[PDB]
């Protein structure tokens, strides 16, 4: 039959690219194309979403983050409109952790890894470097608490807790107390996970207290590398980044491919009931769309431009790739690639804070007891 594809992005070139992608997918069974741009307001955005769902009656909708740098409240109206009728919605360039929870959104799948699983890369790096003692210093928020809980669970899985946990209020101005408390411990590994704005102040207050000398190792995320935080950053930071973060078309092609595979595996089923084209008319839950989401989440993708993409039972991509970036004398340089489960370094070397080139102990066994 004639089953169109749903996708809502804001770019003419990306719209033409998505049209070509869905045409190539239909070439590989009649699949049409339906695309709607983004509005500055979100109430009119949801109104237009329901209007387009009426005029098209799609099975699933695709959505990506606009060039706006917030990427927080942009997919929430689309996700709410999708969950109103229990139909699945897939995100492309949204990595927030609030969407990982199935409580708010009953049907939502992402294509980028969340910051929670990013903490597992830190666990693997500490394991391969034999760093049992760490100082987890994160902010106080939803994503921060989720990442802290994930890291605590992954550490307790091996019967080992964290040396100390320190939390600060986001958007503060003085964190000297937390740093003074941390500087009186036996560990020498400080992990950081917060926004780009807090990282500058953290690095400034750290350098102001001589807490960036030799023997200390810093671990941050992608968000703490970019932005104006780069101006205040000691040499030797081991950060991470995404391979196809700002490239929308790369993810859009894979999304079109996997949704074409999904609809091809779907149309051969029984009791198929198309969603009602009466956005204004219907007031019930469509018989299809929950089961379609369930079979899409378990639909193992064949191949993609970004490698084999899989999905766990949380609406998040699994077995992603990260670029292990580093800072060497105010110059960013790559050290390796995280290939799913193995960290392979390149021929280059690492420049630790202070200038020495050696694996730090990360544990100072000072002897002054109370």
């Amino acid at each position: 039959k004639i089953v169109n594809i749903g996708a809502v992005l804001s770019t003419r070139k990306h719209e033409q690219m998505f049209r070509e992608a869905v045409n190539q997918a239909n070439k590989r069974i009649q699949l049409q194309a339906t695309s709607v741009t983004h509005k500055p307001n979100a109430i009119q955005m949801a109104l237009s979403v329901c209007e387009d769902l009426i005029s098209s009656q799609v099975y699933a909708i695709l959505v990506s983050h606009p060039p706006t740098p917030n990427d927080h409240f942009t997919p929430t109206p689309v996700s709410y409109t999708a969950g109103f009728y229990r139909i699945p919605v897939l995100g492309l360039t949204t990595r927030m952790s609030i969407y990982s929870d199935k409580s708010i959104h009953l049907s939502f799948l992402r294509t980028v890894p969340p910051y929670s699983h990013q903490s597992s890369v830190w666990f693997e790096m500490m394991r391969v470097y034999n760093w049992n003692h760490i100082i987890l210093l994160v902010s106080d928020d939803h994503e921060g608490r989720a990442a802290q809980k994930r890291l605590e669970t992954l550490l307790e899985e091996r019967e080992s807790k964290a040396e100390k946990v320190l939390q600060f209020d986001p958007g503060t101005k003085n964190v000297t107390a937390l740093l003074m408390e941390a500087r009186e411990l036996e560990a020498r590994v400080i992990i950081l996970s917060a926004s780009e704005d807090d990282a500058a102040t953290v690095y400034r207050a750290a350098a102001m207290l001589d807490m960036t000398g030799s023997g200390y190792v810093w671990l941050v995320g992608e968000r703490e590398i970019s932005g104006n935080a780069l101006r205040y950053a000691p040499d030797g930071i081991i950060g991470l980044q995404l391979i196809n973060g700002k490239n929308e078309s790369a993810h859009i092609s894979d999304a079109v491919g996997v949704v074409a595979q999904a609809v091809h595996e779907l149309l051969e089923k029984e009791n198929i009931t198309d969603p009602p084209r009466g956005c204004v008319g219907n007031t019930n839950i469509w018989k299809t769309g929950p089961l379609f989401k369930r079979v899409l989440m378990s639909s193992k993708y064949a191949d993609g431009v970004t490698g084999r993409v899989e999905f766990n039972e949380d609406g998040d991509r699994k077995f992603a790739q990260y670029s292990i970036m580093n800072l060497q004398n105010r110059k960013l340089v790559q050290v390796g690639i995280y290939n799913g489960t193995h960290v392979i370094p390149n021929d280059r070397k690492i420049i630790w804070p202070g200038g020495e080139t050696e694996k730090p102990r990360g544990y100072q066994m000072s002897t002054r007891l109370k």
């Binding site: 002897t367 002054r368 007891l369 109370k370």
Partner: protein, 50 residues
């Protein structure tokens, strides 16, 4: 916090232990004056020893 001086069995025991282990110490008295017990207050996000 008035500086006093202590002496007794455990004092010389800790002296000998620090001598054979070769480290330094900085003693301080108890804060509340109790060995230790569970302090169960309604205090939904609170549970610790006193």
């Amino acid at each position: 916090t008035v500086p006093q001086c202590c002496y007794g069995f455990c004092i010389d025991l800790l002296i000998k232990l620090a001598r054979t282990m070769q480290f330094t110490y900085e003693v301080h008295l108890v804060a509340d004056g109790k060995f230790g017990t569970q302090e169960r207050v309604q205090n939904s996000n609170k549970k610790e020893w006193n």
